[PDB]
Amino acid sequence: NPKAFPLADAALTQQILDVVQQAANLRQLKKGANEATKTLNRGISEFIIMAADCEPIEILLHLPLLCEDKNVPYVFVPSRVALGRACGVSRPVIAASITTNDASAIKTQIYAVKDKIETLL
Amino acid sequence: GARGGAKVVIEPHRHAGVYIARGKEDLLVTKNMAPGESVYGEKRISVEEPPTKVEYRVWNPFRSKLAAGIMGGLDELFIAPGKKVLYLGAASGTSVSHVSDVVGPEGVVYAVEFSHRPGRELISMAKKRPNIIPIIEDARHPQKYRMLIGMVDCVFADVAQPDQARIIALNSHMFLKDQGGVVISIKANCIDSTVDAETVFAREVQKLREERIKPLEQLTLEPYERDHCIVVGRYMRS
Amino acid sequence: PRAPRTYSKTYSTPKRPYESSRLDAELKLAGEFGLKNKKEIYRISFQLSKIRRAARDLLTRDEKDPKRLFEGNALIRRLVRVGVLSEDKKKLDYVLALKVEDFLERRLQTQVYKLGLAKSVHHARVLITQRHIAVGKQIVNIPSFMVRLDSEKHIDFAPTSPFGGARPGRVARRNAARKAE
Amino acid sequence: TRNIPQVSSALFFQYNQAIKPPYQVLIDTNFINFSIQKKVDIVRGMMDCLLAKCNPLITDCVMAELEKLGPKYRIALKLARDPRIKRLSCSHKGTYADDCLVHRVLQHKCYIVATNDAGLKQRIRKIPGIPLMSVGGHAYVIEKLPDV
Amino acid sequence: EMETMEFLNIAQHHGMPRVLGVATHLDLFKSQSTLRASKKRLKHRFWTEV
Amino acid sequence: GKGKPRGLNSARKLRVHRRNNRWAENNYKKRLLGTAFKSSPFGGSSHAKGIVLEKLGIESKQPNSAIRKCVRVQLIKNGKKVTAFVPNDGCLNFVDENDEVLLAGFIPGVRFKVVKVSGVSLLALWKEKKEKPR
Amino acid sequence: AVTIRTRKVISNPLLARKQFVVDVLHPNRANVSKDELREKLAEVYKAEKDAVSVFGFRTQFGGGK
Amino acid sequence: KRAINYQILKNKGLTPKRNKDNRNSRVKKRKKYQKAQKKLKSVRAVYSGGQSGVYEGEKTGIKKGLTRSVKFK
RNA sequence: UUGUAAUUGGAAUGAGUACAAUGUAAAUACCUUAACGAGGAACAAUUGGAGGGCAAGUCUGGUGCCAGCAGCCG
Numbered sequence A: 001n002p003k004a005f006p007l008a009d010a011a012l013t014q015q016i017l018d019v020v021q022q023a024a025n026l027r028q029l030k031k032g033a034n035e036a037t038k039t040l041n042r043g044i045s046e047f048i049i050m051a052a053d054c055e056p057i058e059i060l061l062h063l064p065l066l067c068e069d070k071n072v073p074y075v076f077v078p079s080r081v082a083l084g085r086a087c088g089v090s091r092p093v094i095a096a097s098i099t100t101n102d103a104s105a106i107k108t109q110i111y112a113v114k115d116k117i118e119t120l121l
Numbered sequence B: 001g002a003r004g005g006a007k008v009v010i011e012p013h014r015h016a017g018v019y020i021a022r023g024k025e026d027l028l029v030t031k032n033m034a035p036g037e038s039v040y041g042e043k044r045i046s047v048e049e050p051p052t053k054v055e056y057r058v059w060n061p062f063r064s065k066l067a068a069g070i071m072g073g074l075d076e077l078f079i080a081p082g083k084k085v086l087y088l089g090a091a092s093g094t095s096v097s098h099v100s101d102v103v104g105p106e107g108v109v110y111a112v113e114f115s116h117r118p119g120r121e122l123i124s125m126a127k128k129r130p131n132i133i134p135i136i137e138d139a140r141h142p143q144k145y146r147m148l149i150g151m152v153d154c155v156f157a158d159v160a161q162p163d164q165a166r167i168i169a170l171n172s173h174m175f176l177k178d179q180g181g182v183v184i185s186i187k188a189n190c191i192d193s194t195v196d197a198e199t200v201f202a203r204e205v206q207k208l209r210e211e212r213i214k215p216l217e218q219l220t221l222e223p224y225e226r227d228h229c230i231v232v233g234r235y236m237r238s
Numbered sequence C: 001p002r003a004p005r006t007y008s009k010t011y012s013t014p015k016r017p018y019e020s021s022r023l024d025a026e027l028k029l030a031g032e033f034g035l036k037n038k039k040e041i042y043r044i045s046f047q048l049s050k051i052r053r054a055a056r057d058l059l060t061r062d063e064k065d066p067k068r069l070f071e072g073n074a075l076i077r078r079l080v081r082v083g084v085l086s087e088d089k090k091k092l093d094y095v096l097a098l099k100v101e102d103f104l105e106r107r108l109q110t111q112v113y114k115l116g117l118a119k120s121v122h123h124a125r126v127l128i129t130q131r132h133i134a135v136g137k138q139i140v141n142i143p144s145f146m147v148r149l150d151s152e153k154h155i156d157f158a159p160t161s162p163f164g165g166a167r168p169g170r171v172a173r174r175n176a177a178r179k180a181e
Numbered sequence D: 001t002r003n004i005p006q007v008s009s010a011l012f013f014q015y016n017q018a019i020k021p022p023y024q025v026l027i028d029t030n031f032i033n034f035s036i037q038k039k040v041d042i043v044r045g046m047m048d049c050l051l052a053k054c055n056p057l058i059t060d061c062v063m064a065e066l067e068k069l070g071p072k073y074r075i076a077l078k079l080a081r082d083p084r085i086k087r088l089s090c091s092h093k094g095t096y097a098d099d100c101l102v103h104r105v106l107q108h109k110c111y112i113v114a115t116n117d118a119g120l121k122q123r124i125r126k127i128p129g130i131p132l133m134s135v136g137g138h139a140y141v142i143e144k145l146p147d148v
Numbered sequence E: 001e002m003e004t005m006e007f008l009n010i011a012q013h014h015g016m017p018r019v020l021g022v023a024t025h026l027d028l029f030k031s032q033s034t035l036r037a038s039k040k041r042l043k044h045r046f047w048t049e050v
Numbered sequence F: 001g002k003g004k005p006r007g008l009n010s011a012r013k014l015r016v017h018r019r020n021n022r023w024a025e026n027n028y029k030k031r032l033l034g035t036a037f038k039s040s041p042f043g044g045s046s047h048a049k050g051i052v053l054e055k056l057g058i059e060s061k062q063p064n065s066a067i068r069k070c071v072r073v074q075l076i077k078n079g080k081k082v083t084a085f086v087p088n089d090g091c092l093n094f095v096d097e098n099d100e101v102l103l104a105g106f107i108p109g110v111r112f113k114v115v116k117v118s119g120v121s122l123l124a125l126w127k128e129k130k131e132k133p134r
Numbered sequence G: 001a002v003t004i005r006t007r008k009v010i011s012n013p014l015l016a017r018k019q020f021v022v023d024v025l026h027p028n029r030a031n032v033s034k035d036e037l038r039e040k041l042a043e044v045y046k047a048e049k050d051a052v053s054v055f056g057f058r059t060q061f062g063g064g065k
Numbered sequence H: 001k002r003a004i005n006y007q008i009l010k011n012k013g014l015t016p017k018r019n020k021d022n023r024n025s026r027v028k029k030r031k032k033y034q035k036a037q038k039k040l041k042s043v044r045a046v047y048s049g050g051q052s053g054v055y056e057g058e059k060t061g062i063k064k065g066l067t068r069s070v071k072f073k
Numbered sequence I: 001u002u003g004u005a006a007u008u009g010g011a012a013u014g015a016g017u018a019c020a021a022u023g024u025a026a027a028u029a030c031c032u033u034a035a036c037g038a039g040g041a042a043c044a045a046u047u048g049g050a051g052g053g054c055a056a057g058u059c060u061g062g063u064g065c066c067a068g069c070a071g072c073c074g
């Protein structure tokens, strides 16, 4: 019913943000709504993360429209300041994207989180 | 491969309403009901005929589970020009618009979909194509939309649901004609991921037999897709 | 004289080694898991057969039998600990549903491959046998080492390994010395 | 149009990588005697033979043969109706069980065939990757199932 | 050495008499381990001819 | 009534009958009386020593014929003369008259093959890994 | 650096001594000879070197302790 | 001093020529398995990552009169 | 896109050699470890079975040019 949906819980958000920090270290993270849009256009995004406290929320609702069209999992986190923190950027992030790479060193947990996100959807 | 300015030779396929475009590579194509546009960005082939410029659309096996089926060589396809078809799981016009091409102006396509957001584009596509009747409704309760549909010659189910067998039987029980067509797309991962694919397909075939659908044919869809088989059957009421 | 030290055979020859389907099966198992020879497959099969025969015998006993409860619970705990049996499947019936592949994946070679430390199962074998892999703080050189759930997260390059932060191996420093000279 | 049936995806040369525990096994009519005659219980002679949970399956055709047998083989009939034995519906007119069994294994490579008929066994043997179960001596025997 | 075996082959062809191998200069070895291995290799080779 | 006593106290007649009848088996009779080795080709041994009497096929025109590989050997244990196979004519060169040959079980009628000559393996000679001591 | 940890310490006034198991962490070193272990233990327990005995030292597979 | 040579020392005698793969069974089985997989790609269509980029058509061509599906009797 | 390399690049490593230490009643060995120790990695894995092909070559038989045997020998 709410526009931000599904919204990850306190437990689930941690593992998602865990993958986010690991991805940032390995240059496998795309930060910001504009970048996430580009990845969805290219079909190189494993899944998309959004912040449910975006002010206003609407300016990132185009990712959900893109996502299930391309059959890409997505999920919302309560906080953007927290999301920006894990991203490694000194500013809040309302949306980010995990780039697809089957040769990545952190593949396994990416699929683990992705499986849960699919279940939540 | 198939670049923009390449010239190709178009020839009919064994199944009526399906055509083959030849060249260094071969493309299996369908005539465009609404020429001059692509529905999901597919390549289009234009031919000058006395002179009218008829158009054709490429038909990607990696996008439509049906298409990979014909690539694999299904013996019988009830989908034919001038036939009524009931499409379940019409997420969008990616595959429905092509089924509309095969049936032609005389036939129609009853496109059934549940989730609202994909349905919107299905309505938008239905505007260009007179012969589709999209029905934004949950297939699990065919009582709701019995108003909109008469008999249908063939029922196609692309629904990815664990109880997909029940939906087919209920829909087939209502609108499918005696000796009608049944074509099902099965994904074992959605039905039962615990067991192997082959066990699942046997189970699905079994449920169809319980529902008075005589299975006629099944085909695995590799290399285009994993763990997928299209089962073709006939509805034997008596 | 001193008391005997017991010994046992860890593998048994099959009932019919010459079945073509079987031969293809060991071809699969060796190829996918990079096993040196058939004896490894026979060993794993023998261990699995012992386990499942014990499980069957335990099942034959009536439910609530103290022997049944105790020994079945112990077997399930061990199988869960080694990781063949998933947490949600703690019943003796699913033990009978185990397969050789489950044990094979838990081998340190396969785990090293999956974790990304090696680009091939054979690369994993050569890395292990060359003393580059350490579980926790200890170095393991045995591809047949079975990894536990807790141990799985601690697999890493050994501190002494050149890949693990030690000095370069002999070849590297030899090449550097000749280049400097 | 020419037909070249596609060999099943469950098969790598001669090993079926799909048949796995718990096994699904089709019961042939003659199997019941040599089970009863040898005092071998159906469910568990299978478990002892295969060391797994086995799901016996009786089709309509094999069932249809059984009542046709008559009073002499009532015990076989009753064991066939043991609720642990699930039933498979058939949608082909013929009641000849041997043909029905051969078709089902041709269709999907997930069944073990439990029979002692030499003619049927040879036909199944020609089909690759079909484990063939039989009863001899004192208990059941499985030939083409190396996971054993 | 060659001279040893040339004699052995000559003895083999013209009728083997009793042959006793006697190994010398073993004190020249520096390590016990290598001494034993040489003894093992020498004995096994010698076992082949006689 | 199957022709055998069946009372709960009748094992003795069963036992005695079983012991008396068990002698009917040829296998049992041979095992107990120790006569199972009469049928053995070597009279109970796995290998037999022999003396090479004559190489019968040495004059044969066809090379590597079955006849060429037959050698007449005198079994030293009893003096009975027998025939044996050699693996090949190349091996036949090593075998010459009046040498020790160790025979093992194998032109029908010839049931022995030479495995050692003069205390050395024929295979070892044929692979050229040893020299026959004379 | 090298560290010496004493465990399972027992005080045996019957034999007038203290028994224990010595674990020696010696990263980047082959091992510690009994002499250095003796002088370090003597310093730690404040006794004369001649009063310290050490034996039965085995380095685990892989080295380091 | 006249030292013995290699033929003398090892005394391998006359042996057939043997391929290097036999020296390590692991390499031999690896090669056997990969050869098997290549043969399977000929025996059957096997999935190979799916679609990679724009769809360029079938490279091997369509046979209108050939059906590969398995029939119910 | 399959097969074959006395082709080619720099990384890893123990059999072995060996300071030292540990080990031991004293020693050897094991676990450690300075330093050496790899392209034919000649640092030279074996045991059996099956099937070829080659000549101005050899033997045997005959409804011509063939067949059998076999072929370290031309």
Ligand SMILES: [Mg+2]
Binding pocket: C131, C160
């Ligand atoms: Mg090291």
Ligand SMILES: [Mg+2]
Binding pocket: E033
């Ligand atoms: Mg040694």
Ligand SMILES: [Mg+2]
Binding pocket: F001
């Ligand atoms: Mg009577």
Ligand SMILES: [Zn+2]
Binding pocket: D059, D060, D061, D062, D089, D090, D091, D092, D100
């Ligand atoms: Zn039937």
